[PDB]
Structure 1
Amino acid sequence: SDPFLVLLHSVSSSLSSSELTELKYLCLGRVGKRKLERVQSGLDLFSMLLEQNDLEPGHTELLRELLASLRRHDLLRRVDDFEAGAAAGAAPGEEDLCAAFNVICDNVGKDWRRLARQLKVSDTKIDSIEDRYPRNLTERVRESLRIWKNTEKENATVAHLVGALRSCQMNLVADLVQEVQQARDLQNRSG
């Protein structure tokens, strides 16, 4: 029940029925026959491409290609501001993620070196960071968390962090974060 996705639903509901039809087809190289044929409503592009992650509830640059193509600049500009500047709780997954991340942040092993690799923080950074601060905790925990929430901010889903937590091997908080995930995903993916 997400404010950005509401807005996505709201641009779809501001569009005519041919245009929805056309949009389905015209995405030839992006939605192909099988994916094409099965979807029901006008929303069901929007529904799917969120689902498969062609966009997120942060920025939808790809979706804004589609909006642009179908002329309506009016629809664009409201959506544009949302993505440009008003990304405060726009993806609402971040908060329970941040909650969980705060919890993980408190109990820390020297394993942010493995973990930053595993999550795919860039190796040229890792190599340097490793060399720079070998034995220490402090600048590692600050680097690793900052670079992760820089890198995977637009793909901050709880599964990343669930997997990440377990890598650091704090098991008590693991099951806690898992129920954070389980209840949160279910309710929020639903609509």
Structure 2
Amino acid sequence: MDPFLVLLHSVSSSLSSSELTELKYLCLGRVGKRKLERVQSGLDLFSMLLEQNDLEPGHTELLRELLASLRRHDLLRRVDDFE
């Protein structure tokens, strides 16, 4: 049970290696380096942060914040929606 988790599995396909490469660079130091080593597509990094960091059914200012630096709009609208 986690509407937001399902929202990360869908938006993950709309990120591609391009958006994953951006949030990954900013993650180097912000979230950690070992976290990116385990990541592979996108839902992986969203599963660790949601586990314990700054992600929840109604609290994702950290992840959405990175999307703000990327200057996105469709990804920030869906994520911010479930938030």
Cα deviation for residue 30 of structure 1 reads: 1.7
Contact 1:25 1:36 in 2 (8 A): no
Count residues with an aligned counterpart: 80
Secondary structure of 2:77's match? helix
Report the alpha carbon displacement of residue 70 of structure 1 after superposing the two structures with TM. Answer: 2.4
Relative distance call for 1:80 and 1:31 in structure 2 (3 A) is closer
Aligned-pair distance for 1:65?
A: 0.6
| Matches of 2:79 and 2:22, distance apart in 1 | 21
CA distance 1:73–1:22, change in 2 (3 Å)? closer
Name the counterpart of 1:64: 64
Q: Larger Cα Rg: Structure 1 or Structure 2?
A: 1
SS in 1 for 2:29: coil
Distance 1:61 1:15 in 2: 18
C-alpha distance in 1, partners of 2:16/2:70? 10
**Aligned-residue offset at 1:69:** 2.2
Distance 2:36 2:42 in 1: 12
Task: Say whether the 8 Å CA contact 2:23–2:67 is kept in structure 1.
Answer: no
Distance in 2 of aligned mates of 1:37 and 1:6: 23
Residue 18 of structure 1 aligns to a residue whose secondary structure is helix
Instruction: Using the TM superposition, give the Cα deviation of residue 44 of structure 1 relative to its aligned residue in structure 2, in angstroms.
Output: 1.2
TM-score, reference length from structure 2:
0.73
Unaligned residue ranges in structure 2 (runs of 5+):
none
2:17·2:41 contact (CA, 8 Å) conserved in 1? no
Tell me, in whole angstroms, the C-alpha distance in 2 between the residues paired with 1:78 and 1:72: 11
Q: Counterpart of 2:30 in 1: which secondary structure?
A: coil
Deviation at 1:8, TM superposition (A): 2.1
Pairwise CA RMSD: 1.9
User: 1:75 and 1:19, CA in 2 relative to 1: closer, same or farther beyond 3 A?
Assistant: closer
Aligned with 2:71: secondary structure?
coil
Q: Which runs of 5+ in 1 are unaligned?
A: 82-191
